[PDB]
Structure formats: structure tokens, C-alpha cells
Amino acid sequence: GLTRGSFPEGFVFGTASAAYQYEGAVKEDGRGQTIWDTFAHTFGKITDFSNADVAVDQYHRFEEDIQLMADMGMDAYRFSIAWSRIYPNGVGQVNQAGIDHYNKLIDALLAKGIQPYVTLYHWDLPQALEDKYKGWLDRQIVDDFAAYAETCFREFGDRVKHWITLNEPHTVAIQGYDAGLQAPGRCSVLLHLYCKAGNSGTEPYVVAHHFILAHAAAASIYRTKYKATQNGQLGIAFDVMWFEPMSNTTIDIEAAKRAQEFQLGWFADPFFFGDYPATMRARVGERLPRFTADEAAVVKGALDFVGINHYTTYYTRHNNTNIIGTLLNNTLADTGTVSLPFKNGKPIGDRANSIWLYIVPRGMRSLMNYVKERYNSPPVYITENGMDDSNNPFISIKDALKDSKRIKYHNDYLTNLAASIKEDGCDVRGYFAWSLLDNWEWAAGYSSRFGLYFVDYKDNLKRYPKNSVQWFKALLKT
């Protein structure tokens, strides 16, 4: 079976978390309102009517949780900084209590020998910036994010050596501005009646452009002022499904390739080559912003590593939008593809609790090779991988702990990962399980349990280890 010896010497194993999903204490120690506070407190936005005002209270309970990590022998913890705890209004007055908080968390981790991997932006934009200029829709976001990033480099960079500037910009751009299913909930009202405003054809591309520039702006500051003395590295965590052709036809083979370009390439082609993928330029046309030559020069080469959030694999077929009908532009239509976890009625694999999450371990290996080939072997971290159980009130806690399916998931995905490294030569440096604890899974609320530890929401957030805890412990034994 898998051991640490199955991976390169120095390979980093960790668990991942995110501020809004974990912290609670939403109105404590000066924290400003975010777009997700607003979204979670708006009717219709969260499926189980819940919110993250308390979440799992990691803001207060982080030392306990650090012990639960050390219990498995974890090397690292990925966590995010809530921008609104540092600048409650996005810009302006620095909140010293926010700085003090993350210093305590960082020092506590390091005292246990656990390395901090810090995400600067995990979707919780300060509401003040949304009100001021509609957040990621305005170019001002670029300098404002970079200033926030700089403050974090200055305050924490003496100890934090691994930075993830942005989490899943693809998800944010599509879910936040095309589907309007995540904050700020914008979209073409003609496509989705539940949105109050937006444009699914234009806004995702504007937001994505601004994410790319924001990262490059923060990376430029890091490299020019902090990197030589701090000696850390900056990356991004990209959401990436693997896509397989729905049929063995060149049209569908090309469609799967194109779907990948529109998902990963949308962001990574700028960072590696200085422009968007040709397919996107061709299909999105004037709705796709253009980089200036000076912007291309700051954007290209802006990553030290590629973070991959990888969960699942879908089939992809070529698709043409209906030639007759009122054309309502949107990002899926622009791809010229449809991707689905079914082929001829048959699912691609077993499903986890999440309706989108199909269990397809080979996708991990295929994707690692894809990244190696297209981008000339950049260092990669698997910044998230995992699966969820239901929140089932009809079973005992003891039965909820029997997560053999999660164990098989991690086993099979890691086995594929180990083979991509040893056999295929992929430069993978680490792996972080989503997630350490059951937590508030955005619009899914508390209905989805991704943790290695079970959280009893009906007993003051008590943590219990699921069977996967012992599985990871055995795996990581040195």
C-alpha cells in the first residue's frame, strides 16, 4: 500500500480549509462585512437556509484543530486570510486585531512543526469594495488587492513561505457572474430569473481579466520587494475537472481539449504564454479583454507554482448553440462544448454526496500529464482533493464516522498521483486534502460533509475523527 516512500523525499502532505467556511466570529475583533455575509443572509442563496456566522468556530478553536492535524502527522495546513479582518473596508484603516489573530495562528502551526500555506483570496471580498465599485468588475480591484497582498507579505512573510494569491478564479467568474449561484450572485436575468442584475456574456470575462492582473500585481510586489529576503513562493489554486471525449471521434477529442482550454487555459495560458488561448480569442471575440504589452510582460511568468484543485472528470462533446433562437451569451455557450458525467446514460463513476462530484481516480493522472506537457513541467501542488458525505440526521454519529468511501477515494487518487510522479515524471510537490473538518460548504451549507473530522453541529461543534483520520495517520507514519 501507499506510504511516504511512494512519493518523492520532501513531498508535503496537508489538509485545507478556508476562512469563511471555518472561522465564524463574523462580527468579532473588527472584521468587516463581506459579499458572502451579504449573500448568506439573502433569501434563496443558501440551499439549507444556513449561514457561517459561527461555522465551526475555528477563529477560537484553532489550537484544538492544530492538535487534530498533528494527530495524523500532517506536514502543512492550507488556510486563508479573511481580507476583511485585515482591511474591514477593503482599503483604508488596517485592523491590528486581524494581524494579531493570524500571527497567533501562524505561530501555533509552526510550533507544532506544521507549515502554513496561505491563500490570500478565498472568495470573501469586503462588501465595502462591492459597494464602492462593484468589486472584481472594476480595474481598481487590481491595486486594492495588491495592497492587501503587500500588507500580508510585510506582516507574515517572515514565516509564511507559500502563498496562494487566489482560489479558483474560474469558479468565481462563472458561478459569481454567469450562473449567479455564488456571491455576488450576478447574471443575465434573461438566463436566470433569480439574479437581480448582471450580464453572463460579458462580466465573467471582465472578472477573470481582473483576477489575472491582480495576481500579477501582487507577484510583481512580491518579487521586487519581498522574495529576495523572505525566500517564499507565490501561486494560484485553479479549479480543474479533467475532460475525456464523449466518443472516439476527432470532433469530441478536440472538444475535450477545448473545454480544458476554457477552464484551465483561460488563466494558465496568460501566466505561461502572455495571452488567452487562441480558442477563446476566436469564440469570445471582443467580449474577451486584451492585455497591453506591458500587462503581458507582468503577467507572463507570474507563477512560481501551479495549485490544482482537482476532484472529478466529465465527458465532453462538441456542441453548437441552437441556430434558431434568441442568443443569450454565456460562458458554456462560448466553449462550443457540453461536459457531463454521463455517456449513453451511464455515469462516469460512483458519485460522492455533491451532485457534481464523480469519483474518477485516473483523472488525477491524466491531468498531471496534461499540465506537464502544456506548460513545460511547472511545479504543481494538489491544493485540494477530497469528497463528501451527506449530512444524514437518520444515522448515528458512530455510523457517520465510517467513511470507507472517502478512504477509497484518497487511496485511489493518491495512487494515481504517485504514478504520475514516479512513472510519468510530473513535478508534483505536495497534496492537501479537502477538508480537515466538516464545514460550511458555501451554497450547499451544512448539507455536505468533506472533513476527515466529523463536526457535531448539535453538540457545540464537537470534533470526532472519521476512520480516514487513522488512514492518513498510518499513511504518514515516518
Side-chain angles (χ1 to χ4, degrees), residues 1-103 105-285 287-372 374-421 423-478:
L2 296 170
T3 72
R4 275 191 189 266
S6 307
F7 297 87
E9 288 175 13
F11 189 88
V12 177
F13 284 96
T15 59
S17 69
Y20 199 63
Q21 309 181 254
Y22 270 66
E23 285 188 352
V26 289
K27 285 164 188 284
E28 193 166 333
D29 291 319
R31 178 176 177 281
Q33 175 103 340
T34 73
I35 62 177
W36 270 96
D37 295 293
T38 305
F39 198 71
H41 286 273
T42 299
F43 173 72
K45 306 311 189 185
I46 317 298
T47 68
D48 71 343
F49 315 99
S50 66
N51 64 57
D53 291 3
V54 171
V56 298
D57 196 38
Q58 191 166 87
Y59 188 80
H60 299 107
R61 301 185 193 203
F62 63 85
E63 302 229 42
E64 172 187 2
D65 293 340
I66 292 171
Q67 191 58 69
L68 301 179
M69 298 171 214
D71 283 354
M72 298 177 287
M74 290 293 165
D75 302 318
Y77 187 50
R78 178 170 169 233
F79 70 88
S80 77
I81 296 171
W83 183 338
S84 73
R85 289 202 194 277
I86 311 302
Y87 293 88
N89 298 312
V91 292
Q93 194 181 164
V94 185
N95 181 50
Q96 187 61 50
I99 290 165
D100 296 342
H101 173 71
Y102 292 109
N103 275 330
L105 172 59
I106 290 164
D107 293 343
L109 284 161
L110 285 174
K112 286 289 188 179
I114 293 156
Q115 274 303 299
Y117 281 63
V118 177
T119 307
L120 292 176
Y121 187 73
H122 204 304
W123 303 358
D124 41 6
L125 182 80
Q127 181 69 43
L129 299 183
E130 192 75 10
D131 296 343
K132 199 202 281 217
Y133 56 64
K134 305 187 203 296
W136 291 101
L137 290 176
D138 195 284
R139 183 67 174 254
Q140 183 60 43
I141 197 68
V142 174
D143 290 343
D144 288 359
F145 173 80
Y148 155 63
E150 181 157 17
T151 291
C152 296
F153 305 148
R154 287 205 335 113
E155 294 298 335
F156 310 123
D158 63 299
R159 281 151 295 134
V160 175
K161 301 312 173 176
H162 305 88
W163 299 100
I164 292 142
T165 53
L166 304 170
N167 181 255
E168 306 200 349
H170 166 87
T171 301
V172 178
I174 301 313
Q175 298 310 300
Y177 303 81
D178 184 352
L181 291 171
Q182 291 178 340
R186 292 174 66 90
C187 82
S188 293
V189 73
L190 282 169
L191 279 165
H192 305 107
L193 288 174
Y194 49 78
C195 306
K196 186 179 163 176
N199 190 323
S200 298
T202 56
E203 293 189 353
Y205 302 106
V206 172
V207 173
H209 204 242
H210 293 159
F211 274 130
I212 293 158
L213 298 171
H215 175 272
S220 175
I221 296 170
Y222 191 70
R223 292 178 162 164
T224 57
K225 299 170 74 164
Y226 299 95
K227 196 182 198 169
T229 61
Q230 297 181 349
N231 249 68
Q233 58 178 356
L234 252 67
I236 282 178
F238 295 114
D239 57 290
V240 189
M241 290 189 185
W242 185 241
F243 298 119
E244 293 181 354
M246 209 172 270
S247 66
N248 193 201
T249 67
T250 56
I251 289 281
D252 284 348
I253 291 163
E254 295 304 304
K257 291 179 185 189
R258 185 164 63 255
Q260 200 52 78
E261 285 181 311
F262 271 83
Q263 178 191 48
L264 178 54
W266 187 2
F267 296 91
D269 278 28
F271 294 126
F272 287 104
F273 314 132
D275 205 353
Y276 291 113
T279 1
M280 290 194 71
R281 178 51 59 199
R283 289 169 175 69
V284 180
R287 292 177 288 115
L288 183 69
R290 289 179 185 277
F291 299 100
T292 69
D294 290 343
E295 288 164 356
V298 179
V299 164
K300 180 180 180 180
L303 298 175
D304 297 319
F305 66 84
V306 173
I308 297 287
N309 294 0
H310 174 70
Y311 294 86
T312 196
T313 297
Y314 282 11
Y315 298 111
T316 303
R317 57 169 181 88
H318 184 88
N319 194 65
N320 289 293
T321 64
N322 286 144
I323 190 68
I324 50 191
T326 190
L327 178 54
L328 296 177
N329 280 328
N330 64 87
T331 60
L332 180 62
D334 287 337
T335 69
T337 72
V338 162
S339 300
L340 262 40
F342 294 96
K343 176 183 176 177
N344 302 142
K346 184 184 162 69
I348 195 169
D350 193 26
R351 204 194 86 210
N353 172 72
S354 285
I355 194 50
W356 55 269
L357 207 176
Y358 285 76
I359 300 166
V360 188
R362 63 179 180 269
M364 176 65 86
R365 189 170 181 180
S366 302
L367 173 55
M368 285 308 88
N369 280 99
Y370 178 91
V371 167
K372 178 183 171 59
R374 184 175 185 97
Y375 299 120
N376 304 302
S377 188
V380 171
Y381 285 85
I382 304 308
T383 42
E384 287 173 27
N385 176 67
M387 56 149 278
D388 60 341
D389 311 307
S390 64
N391 186 355
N392 186 350
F394 305 114
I395 67 175
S396 67
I397 294 178
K398 287 182 211 271
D399 280 349
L401 305 188
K402 302 184 177 293
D403 62 346
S404 54
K405 186 197 248 45
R406 170 174 295 106
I407 288 169
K408 179 182 161 47
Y409 184 96
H410 284 112
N411 184 70
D412 288 351
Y413 279 69
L414 284 165
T415 296
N416 277 93
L417 190 62
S420 82
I421 299 160
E423 288 179 45
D424 305 341
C426 298
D427 186 7
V428 184
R429 308 280 180 95
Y431 174 94
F432 291 77
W434 190 265
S435 197
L436 172 66
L437 303 177
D438 293 337
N439 63 79
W440 188 73
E441 300 286 352
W442 306 110
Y446 299 108
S447 69
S448 160
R449 288 182 182 281
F450 269 98
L452 303 183
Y453 289 84
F454 177 93
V455 179
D456 192 349
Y457 299 114
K458 290 174 264 153
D459 186 12
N460 190 35
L461 313 169
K462 185 163 174 62
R463 286 81 155 126
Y464 294 91
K466 301 180 193 169
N467 289 356
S468 51
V469 171
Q470 283 296 306
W471 186 84
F472 272 103
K473 188 181 171 59
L475 176 72
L476 303 177
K477 244 140 198 299
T478 327

